[PDB]
């Protein structure tokens, strides 16, 4: 027959969870083709659009280094030689530290990405520290070696 | 026969645990046969395998419940 | 922990909304980096081998005092008085590491000190992400009638955000140029320690 158990253990009884679109065939294809709880794909009603937000983020950058700016001007801080410049500084930073973080990973045995590797990137090579997210002593031959050129001296 | 041989299924074992962070009734399936040739091989309990069938019949019945009456 | 020493610090600072649980961890994580960073020998009677016996802060706490009621007067009163290490010694050694730093069982003036300064990196942090806020929102600023029964009656009034705390921080960690004077017409990296705000 089959042992219908008196009671089920916590794994058979779990209120599913939203689960990811996973295999790697792809989503929406108007083919011929499932888990019990989709997620929801992600939307927006109405708004500026991130094709404006992503383009107003380099003047809220220099406004907010730029100290600030007068009423009835914004916009233009750069001229159209300097923000080309500043792209490609920004493309340069993020290609160079994830090559240097991944291979930095990948030496300790890892298997996977953490941010403490990028955090050691980031401080050791550029000096930044970014918060909120989580010694050397001399052994005795060293000191031989000083006792000696001290006996030598005196 | 491609199932006979140790290293070929502890290499379909990855295959089966990396397609399990979205259960479905065809992979439920396949991690059950997979537990039962460990099984055979003296390699798990029976209760693991009870267990795995019955949280396939679990989600087939939730997905029988979805569809119209 | 310390979350509720924190929200009441905040308080007396100048937050009166109620900042959210992400704020509360950054301060706590910079706190505790900060805390584990950490006459006088020096002096000009210390020129001689033998030494011979002697013989817009302010503004603004000004005028918040007197614009406060009698009851927040009594909570401004009773939040002046938190604190990281008063008679929680125990719990601030475990919080802070003390064992697998230093040696254990330090003097209870070190204690006094640490949160004496701790209080204020904790006034600092809160007036830098205000004032930051405060320009943020007022560059930002330049459809349901009738009404129900659970609507805030004026709301306006919101908390400072972690974006807010990371720009204080950033600002916070510049040094003089004193300390890069001797870098000038090179291409060198400058590369120092936590600054000890």
């Known amino acids: 027959k089959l042992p219908i ?150 | 026969e491609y199932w006979q041989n140790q290293e070929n299924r502890d290499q379909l074992d990855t295959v089966i645990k990396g397609v399990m962070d979205a259960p479905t009734p065809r992979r439920y399936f396949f991690q059950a ?37 | 922990a310390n979350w509720f020493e924190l929200c009441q610090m905040m308080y007396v600072s100048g937050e009166t909304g109620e900042p959210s649980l992400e704020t509360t961890g950054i301060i706590e994580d910079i706190v505790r980096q900060q805390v584990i960073e950490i006459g006088l020998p020096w002096e000009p009677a210390s020129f001689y081998s033998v030494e011979v016996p002697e013989r817009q802060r302010l503004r603004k706490a000004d005028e918040r005092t007197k614009a406060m009621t009698k009851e927040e007067y009594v909570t401004w009163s009773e939040f002046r008085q938190a604190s990281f290490t008063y008679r929680k010694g125990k719990r601030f050694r475990e919080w802070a590491g003390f064992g697998l730093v230093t040696d254990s069982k330090p003097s209870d003036d070190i204690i006094d000190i640490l949160g004496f300064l701790t209080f204020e990196m904790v006034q600092t942090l809160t007036e830098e992400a205000l ?45 003089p140029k004193k300390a890069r004077a001797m870098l000038n017409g090179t291409k060198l990296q400058q590369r120092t320690q936590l600054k000890l705000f």
């Open chain 1, 5 to 154: 158990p008196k009671v089920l253990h916590d794994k058979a009884i779990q209120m599913p969870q939203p689960v990811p679109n996973i295999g790697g065939a792809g989503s929406g294809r108007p083919t011929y083709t499932q888990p019990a709880l989709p997620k929801t794909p992600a939307f927006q009603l109405e708004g500026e659009g991130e094709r404006v937000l992503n383009k107003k983020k380099l003047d809220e950058l220099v406004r907010q280094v730029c100290g600030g700016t007068a009423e009835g001007q914004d916009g233009n801080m750069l001229t159209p030689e300097v923000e080309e410049s500043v792209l490609n500084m920004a493309d340069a930073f993020v290609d160079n530290v994830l090559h240097q973080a991944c291979r930095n990973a990948k030496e300790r045995g890892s298997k996977v990405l953490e941010i403490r590797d990028i955090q050691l990137v980031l401080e050791r090579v550029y000096n930044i520290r970014i918060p909120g997210y989580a010694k050397v002593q001399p052994n005795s031959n060293w000191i031989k070696k000083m006792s000696a050129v001290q006996a030598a001296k005196v």
């Open chain 2, 33 to 69: 046969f997979m537990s039962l040739l460990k099984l055979h091989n003296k390699q798990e309990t029976p209760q693991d395998f009870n267990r795995v069938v019955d949280e396939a019949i679990q989600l087939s019945i939730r997905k029988w419940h979805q569809l119209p009456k």
């Open chain 3, 131 to 175: 004032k930051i806020k405060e320009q943020e929102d007022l560059h930002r600023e330049r459809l349901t009638g009738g009404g129900g029964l659970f609507d805030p009656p004026n709301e306006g009034r919101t908390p400072v955000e972690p974006r807010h705390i990371q720009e204080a921080f950033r600002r916070l960690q510049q040094r």
